[PDB]
Every structure is written in structure tokens, then in C-alpha cells.
Design a protein around this ligand. Structure first.
Ligand SMILES: Nc1ncnc2c1ncn2[C@@H]1O[C@H](COP(=O)(O)OP(=O)(O)O)[C@@H](O)[C@H]1O
Ligand SMILES: Nc1ncnc2c1ncn2[C@@H]1O[C@H](COP(=O)(O)OP(=O)(O)O)[C@@H](O)[C@H]1O
Ligand SMILES: [Mg+2]
Ligand SMILES: [Mg+2]
Ligand SMILES: [Mg+2]
Ligand SMILES: [Mg+2]
Lengths: 291, 211, 294, 211
């Protein structure tokens, strides 16, 4: 492979094929910080990896999550395989950068930006010739490298499915970071909408295509004598009797602008009706302009 | 006692974060006897992420809050129970969209729907020795309190009691679902940890409803 | 497995181990309709499956997407393996219900609600004894069953990674349906927000914790003589000069209600009654400014 | 002349839905010579979905529209190009949050970030025979037009003409990335399909800018 060869030409500068020493390994405090920085990605990755292990066990393999700097954050899988790798220097905190352990999927995934497998003597370091590694980089909410999913097994036990597995897990974890961020974005829009409702002069009531009140501000609650906090999520037809004008406009999905109307004891207001036309159906905002 | 406010729901979930922290060892210990020894660890991973997210969403509606929660539980707990507790909360979320308060009948409906979701997803039956062995009587407890027009605080105290009995009732059941059922007859004599989780939740809801 | 044995008891009622015939296979128009209503899950599933294949080839195996009724919607993988499964009746539109083909992961996954693998003589039908199947069900945006991901291969070539692979792919397609629905939810809230802004009486301008204008309605844009479409997404500092009263409050994150204020728009003085609404979030403070009509 | 509006962006993406439908068999044919014969089919599959979503979001801001578009391409195209075109649109979307209109300087910034996004994710260099062999000159073209203060429609005609020459220039290149590079020297003499896609996009943007 030109990937492997090109990687060897980077290693040939500073490294020998037969050497192997004690790991470069994040330790005590500084590892606690890396761990904490990676919380969001880590917890998602650990659940996914535990699951992958369960539907796969028994088998001689190990699963790693690594951060963007190729530091091992978490390991799981076969106890004996995990011990064999621990003895080679792969623990929590061990850095697996190309400039340390040689050409290996553990780093080559992030360097190439894709799913990669290395086996046997593809590995720059002889210590690794008894091993296969599969790895896939994973990405942010915002598309930057955030870590790597890897699978390690004795070279003679490797399977055709190992690589697509790491890929599919990295993509699962990526997308899960994305859904966390969509929910935050939707929360920020709700902050906008709630702050507008609370501060504006108009009274407001809006309901769903199914008939349910989605929001009502203090102002509309006072005037239409509704319960300012148990009205929301309830049918608008259960909450108040709508004047004939509105009632017909509603039936037709037809806007009203600054129209006069009277509600039910009797209240006279100048309203606006604003239909919202969506694929799921029609919703309404009704505003009560302050006389 | 006519209703449960959303601020009560938030305080409920905060209290669940605390209980899954302090009872972590115990739940894992229950899970060591009959599973793979992780259930407390995992509920704590899930619920601490839940409680982390809560301040940002505490001013919002019940449906959105339960949706965030179930979504978080869904992807961060793992194993058999994560998808289950997830589904519970997601179903509950879809019944309470835009709500800021729930009457006792509405409370029963939410739990009814969540329970239906967990049954329909895991296929468990009365006697299978799972969390559904607590969900079903809890739902039946809440329906009864709903008919008798009990206050929310008293109703929840009663579901909380039923939930305790129901979890204890799992001890003599042989497991027919999940990892426990690998053990065959050897699962008898040991309390189900998912069931004990549901109990912890009902106990904390009961407390939240006083405040 | 009790799961298999139980499945065998259901199959025992109506079905024999040695029989095999022509498939029950959706057809022409009814198929086109099934394919059409499964579009959202399908297109996501087919991309994911193409990718799983790419990093797995060469290998004697096939990958299937099935709808919630065990109907095969799409197949890909190794040409030869696909022709062998096709010889047994598995094509686009073939139903693989337990009541038709017997105990098999293709159905048992959805029946059990979980990732499942059946091999060799765990299968009810003898015709399947040469095959291994793995399958996992997948779920909606709203939590119900919507389909199944499966991997088929000669029994002697099964690998330990086959099952977790279908599981991870089912979960990925699931979550992608959820992300489509989250984006649609936010669009619906934006509709609420936009409709409020277009139909209300107050003028409104709103900006970021970063200083960038997020929204402005027609009413605010005429009054403050700002460009109605080019202002949004630009620094508010380079849009208009803010009065002393606002400047203070804005630095102090302190609200203002129905207060008097004098503005400047490209060398010109505007008088108005305003409200300033801070929005306090983990990432910083945002603002809403309302211009009340006099 | 002075700016690109969001309506023009929407009309752009609509026209990309059309071009990826009519040019499908062509793009696939380019991909047959040097790949797995699927690029037209996959671009059509993704862009068809994009244009399906677009009426619901067409009244929104440019950032939100590009973000839906990118998110859609990201999971529905597949292979090497899906993640790349998705990254392009996602990066563009983060630069244009809340925008309803972009000046030529801004349009250039948008494409710049877009392209940096695709280079960063795919690690492609000049002469590697990929879509970046069109994106890099396209961005350089918009930068020159911005300096010279050209109108948006003339700027976009220039970048479109440049996109064409840059796609043509891929023909004599040996592939060093993606599926084509498996063929070694045998990829010489055949136009790159990803690069042809970028060209199509630029031609359609040029048309949308007239309207
Ligand atoms: N099909 C099922 N239906 C309902 N509950 C289940 C099912 N399978 C497992 N459970 C519940 O999940 C609990 C185990 O949870 P946990 O240890 O978190 O996951 P795992 O067993 O996969 O490690 C069991 O005690 C049981 O209550
Ligand atoms: N690393 C990369 N950077 C940029 N573009 C790439 C890269 N790898 C592949 N491509 C582009 O993808 C195109 C092929 O896309 P497509 O056929 O959709 O995916 P695949 O090759 O996976 O089937 C190529 O013509 C090339 O332009
Ligand atoms: Mg367990
Ligand atoms: Mg477990
Ligand atoms: Mg291709
Ligand atoms: Mg392909």
C-alpha cells in the first residue's frame, strides 16, 4: 500500500524496526484532565464498545477508544488479550502516535482520515507482527477529528468484519455527538422564543395542528382569564370558547389582521390570527393587541 | 396535591442523579450475582449526564425535558437497560409535549405510555424477572389512585410502596429475559437490578412531589 | 437457546422442516408502494450498507435491509452469494416472516426485539442449514420497529464480528432517523418564532453573545433604518450606534422596561420607547430589544 | 449585482437536484472507468433528498439551509464523496449562521471554509486527482473577483468557467487518493467524477445568481 510505504518512509528517519521500550503514557493528573476533556465522546464510546463486545464475546480481541492525539482513553474486551497488550505497553494513557509505535492503524486512521487496517509485517515495529489493528477516526458536531475507534486481535484471528465494525461504531458515536448538539441548538431557539413571549407587549396563544396549546404568555393569560401554567399541552377547545369570527377563520386556515372580537363573562379585544402552514398541518398564533 | 409541576419533574430527575450515584455499588452488586456486574455503574454514567444537561433545560416544558433525558439515557447507559429506560422517557415525553403541569390522571397516562413502550420494545411478561415486573403494578397503582381522586403526593407515595414490593417480588422469579436468564434456575433467590432501579425512580418521584 | 426452541414450537404447528417452495414476494405495484413509504429508512440504510460492504470485500456474504414486516427492501454484497440466496427465493420483495421460512434471524430479531444470529440446524427449514444469518431490528424517530439489518453467509464462513456489525449499523441508521426528526423539530420552532416576529406589533432586534444580529422584524428595520435582509448575521456594533442608556445596561446584563431612548442610524437621530431583555445561557448573554410603538 | 440572497441559494440547490438527476448516468460512467460505477447514482440519491427537504426550510436563513443540506448529504450519499460534500456544506453553514444575503467577500469566505473543511477531512493535495483539484482553484477565483470588486453574477460565471478547466485538468492526473488510486497509472486519461460534480455545482450557482 502507498499509505503503508509512505508511513514507513516517515518512520525510517527516526526509528528502528526492532526496538521497543516502556510506553509514553499520560499519568496521574494530566491523564485525569485528558479524560475529563473527552467526557462527551468517551461516555458514548464506552457504551457502544461495551455493546459491541457483548454481541461478539467470546473471542481474543480488545477494543480501544483514543483521543485526537492517539492517547488511549478506554479499553475493553477479552481479559487475556487486554493483558497481552498491557504487557506490550498499551494501557489507559498510552500514546500510540506513529512517531512512537510506528506504522499502525491506531494512528494511520487519523493521519489518513479513514478506516484503516494493518497486520503482521505491515507494522513498522516487529513487536507488532503478531497483531492486527483496525481503526477509524471519529468526528465532532463540527467535523474535526475527536478520536479513534480501534480493535486489536492476534493476527491469525482477524476477521473481514472487524474493519467495517470500527467504522460503523465511529460513525454511530459521531452522529450521537451531533444529536447532542442539535438538541442544544433547539434549546437555544426555545430561549429566543420564550424571552420574546415574556417581554413583548402583545398577548399570545398558539396551538398545534392537533388542537393543543403550545404556548401562552402572561399577557394573554390575564385577559382571557386562563391558567397561566396548566393551559399548555391541553386542547384549546377545552380551554375557551372562541368567537364566531375566529372560529370560521380557524376552520378555513385564513389570516385575520387587527380584527375586532369578543370572548367568553365577556371580553372585547383586537386580535391577529396567523396561520402556520406546515407539512404536518396547520397551526395558529393568535395575538391580542393591547387596546 | 392536584398536580405535578415541571419544576417537580426537574427536581425528580436531579434526585435520581443522586440516588444512582450513592446506590451505584449496590445495583452493581445486585448485577454481579446474576448479570455482568455493570448495572449500577451504567445507570450512574447515564443519569449523571442527564443531570449535567438539566440546568440548561429546566425552564422548558415537561415533554422537552423528558425527551432530552430519555435521549441521553438511550445512548449513554448501554446494554439491555439503556434502550429500555430510554424508551420509557421518550414515550413519556411524547405524551407531555408543552405541559407545565400534570394532573394525576395525566401522570398515570404518561407512565402507562412509557411502560407500554418498554414492554413493546423488550417483549417482557409478568414473571420474566425484569423492570416490567415493577412498571406494570406502578401503572396499575397510579390508575387506582387516579379513580379514587387521591392527591398527587399521596398517589406517588403509594406507587412508591407498590414499587418496593414489586421489586422484592422479583427475588423468587426465575429469569426468562436478559443476561440473568442465562443462569437458568440459578437466578432464583436474587433481586433483579433493573427492577430496583425502577423502585429508586419511584421513591425519588414521591420525594419530589412533596416539594 | 430458549428463543430458538420457542420459535420451533410456533413453527411446529403449521410447517415442516423439509419443505421449501417458491417465495411469497411482493410484486409490481404493491412493492413499489412498500419501497416508497420506506424511503427515509432505505436511503440511509443503503448508504450504510454500501459502506459496510466496501470495507469487507472480498468475502462470501450478503447484506439485506428488511421493512417492519420482514419484506426484503434491498440487497448488496458479493454477486455469487446474492445469486445463491436468489436461487433459494430471496429477492427484493421476498417476505421472510417466521410463518414462511421458519426460525431465522431475519424474523427472530424483530420478534425478540434484539440482535440475533441463527446458524446451521438452529434454522427450522433444512434448506437454510448451510447458512448463517445475523440480524438486528431498527427503530423510528419515535421508538417503534421500522426494519431490520441482516447479514447472510455460508455457515462455515461466519465471523464473530458479524452480529455486532448488524447491531452497530441498525443503531446508526436509527440514530440518523432521529437526527432527521430533530432538524424537522427545530424547523417547526423556527416557524413559531418567525410567524411571531412577522405578526406582532413591537419592533424587534436580537443579537448573539458574540455580537451578531440573529433576527430583526420589518417594524424594527424601518424605524432604525437598517437593511431588512443584509443586517442579519452581522455585528450589531457595525450596524447601528447604541445610546448611553443601552450601552450601560448591555454591559451590566441588566433589563430595561418601557424606557425612553435616542438612536443614531447613518448620521440621524431616532426617538423610541424600548425594552431590553437579557437572555442568560451557559455560552454567554444574548439580548432582545423591543421598540414599542408610541 | 452586489450580493447573493438566500432565495438564490435555495434556487441553486434546486438546480443541483436537477443536474444530479439528468447527469446521473454520465457521472456514473466517469466512475465506471476509474471506480466502482456509483458516483452519479449516489449524488442523485443525496441531492434528491436535499431538494425534498428544501421547501420546508426555504424561508429560513442561509446557515440553517446549508446545514440541513450538508447533514443530508453526509448520511445519504455514502462512500468517499458523501462525507466530503457534507463537510463542505456544514462548514459553509457555520460561516453563514442567520445570514439572509452574502456579499462577494462573504461568499468567498464561505467557499474558503467549505474547501478547508474538505481538504482537512480528506487530506487531498493539488494533483491527487480529486474534487479538491476543482475546489482550490474555485476559491482562488472568487478571491480574485472579490479583490477586483466584480458583481456576484460575473464572479460566479468566472468561478464556473474556472471549475470547468479545473475539472478538465484532472483527466491527465494520476490518482493518489480514493478508489481511483487503486488503478495506479491506469487512472490517467479519465476525468475525475467528484471534480465533475463540483463543476456542476458551480455551473448551477452561476445560473441561480442571474435570478
Ligand atoms: N427484554 C427485557 N425487558 C425488560 N427488561 C429487561 C430485558 N432485558 C433486560 N432487562 C432489564 O435490564 C436489567 C439489566 O440491565 P444492565 O445490566 O444495565 O444491562 P446488561 O444486562 O445488558 O448489562 C435486568 O435486571 C432487567 O431488569
Ligand atoms: N481523500 C479525498 N479527498 C477528496 N476527494 C476524494 C478523496 N477520496 C475520494 N475523493 C473523491 O470521491 C470521488 C468518488 O466518489 P464516489 O464514487 O461517490 O465514492 P466512492 O469512490 O467511495 O464510491 C472521486 O472522484 C474523488 O473526487
Ligand atoms: Mg449488566
Ligand atoms: Mg452490560
Ligand atoms: Mg464510486
Ligand atoms: Mg462506492
Amino acid at each position: 500500500s502507498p499509505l503503508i510505504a509512505t508511513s514507513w518512509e516517515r518512520c525510517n528517519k527516526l526509528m528502528k524496526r526492532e526496538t521497543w521500550n516502556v510506553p509514553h503514557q499520560a499519568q496521574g493528573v494530566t491523564f485525569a484532565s485528558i479524560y475529563r476533556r473527552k467526557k462527551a465522546m468517551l461516555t458514548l464510546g464506552q457504551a457502544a464498545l461495551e455493546d459491541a463486545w457483548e454481541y461478539m464475546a467470546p473471542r481474543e480481541c480488545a477494543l480501544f477508544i483514543l483521543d485526537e492525539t492517539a492517547c488511549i482513553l478506554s479499553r475493553n474486551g477479552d481479559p487475556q488479550t487486554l493483558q497481552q497488550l498491557s504487557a506490550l505497553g498499551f494501557n489507559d494513557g498510552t500514546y500510540c502516535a506513529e512517531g512512537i509505535i510506528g506504522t499502525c492503524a491506531l494512528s494511520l486512521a487519523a493521519i489518513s482520515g479513514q478506516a484503516v487496517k494493518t497486520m503482521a509485517d505491515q507494522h513498522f515495529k516487529q513487536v507488532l507482527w503478531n497483531w492486527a489493528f483496525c481503526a477509524t477516526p471519529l468526528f465532532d458536531s463540527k467535523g474535526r477529528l475527536t478520536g479513534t475507534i480501534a480493535l486489536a486481535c492476534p493476527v491469525e484471528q482477524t476477521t473481514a468484519a472487524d474493519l467495517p465494525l470500527t467504522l460503523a461504531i465511529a460513525r454511530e458515536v459521531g452522529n450521537l455527538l451531533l444529536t447532542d448538539s442539535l438538541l442544544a441548538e433547539t434549546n437555544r431557539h426555545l430561549n429566543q422564543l420564550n424571552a420574546l413571549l415574556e417581554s413583548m407587549d402583545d398577548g399570545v396563544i398558539s396551538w398545534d395542528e392537533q388542537g393543543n396549546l403550545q404556548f401562552i404568555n402572561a399577557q394573554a393569560a390575564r385577559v382571557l382569564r386562563l391558567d397561566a401554567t396548566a393551559s399548555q399541552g391541553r386542547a384549546i377547545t377545552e380551554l375557551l370558547t372562541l368567537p364566531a369570527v375566529l372560529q370560521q377563520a380557524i376552520k378555513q386556515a385564513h389570516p385575520l389582521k387587527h380584527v375586532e372580537a369578543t370572548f367568553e363573562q365577556f371580553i372585547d379585544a383586537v386580535i391577529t390570527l396567523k396561520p402556520i402552514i406546515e407539512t404536518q398541518g396547520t397551526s395558529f398564533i393568535l395575538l391580542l393587541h393591547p387596546v | 396535591g392536584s398536580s405535578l409541576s415541571r419544576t417537580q419533574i426537574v427536581n425528580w430527575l436531579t434526585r435520581c442523579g443522586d440516588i444512582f450515584s450513592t446506590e451505584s455499588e449496590y445495583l452493581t452488586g445486585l448485577d454481579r450475582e446474576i448479570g455482568d456486574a455493570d448495572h449500577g455503574l451504567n445507570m450512574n454514567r447515564g443519569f449523571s449526564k442527564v443531570v449535567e444537561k438539566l440546568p440548561a433545560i429546566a425552564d422548558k416544558d415537561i415533554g422537552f425535558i423528558l425527551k432530552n433525558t430519555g435521549m441521553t439515557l438511550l445512548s449513554s447507559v448501554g446494554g439491555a437497560s439503556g434502550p429500555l429506560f430510554g424508551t420509557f422517557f421518550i414515550r413519556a415525553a411524547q405524551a407531555t409535549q408543552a405541559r407545565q403541569s400534570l394532573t394525576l390522571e395525566e401522570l398515570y397516562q404518561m407512565f402507562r405510555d412509557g411502560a407500554d413502550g418498554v414492554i413493546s420494545r423488550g417483549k417482557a411478561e409478568p414473571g420474566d424477572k425484569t423492570m416490567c415486573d415493577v412498571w406494570v403494578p406502578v401503572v396499575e397503582s397510579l390508575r387506582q389512585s387516579s379513580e379514587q381522586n387521591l392527591s398527587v403526593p399521596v398517589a406517588l407515595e403509594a406507587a412508591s410502596s407498590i414499587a418496593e414490593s414489586a421489586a422484592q417480588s422479583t427475588i423468587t422469579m426465575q429469569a426468562r429475559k436478559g443476561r440473568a436468564s442465562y443462569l437458568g434456575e440459578r437466578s432464583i433467590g436474587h433481586q433483579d437490578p433493573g427492577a430496583t432501579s425502577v423502585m429508586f425512580m419511584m421513591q425519588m418521584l414521591a420525594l419530589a412531589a412533596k416539594e
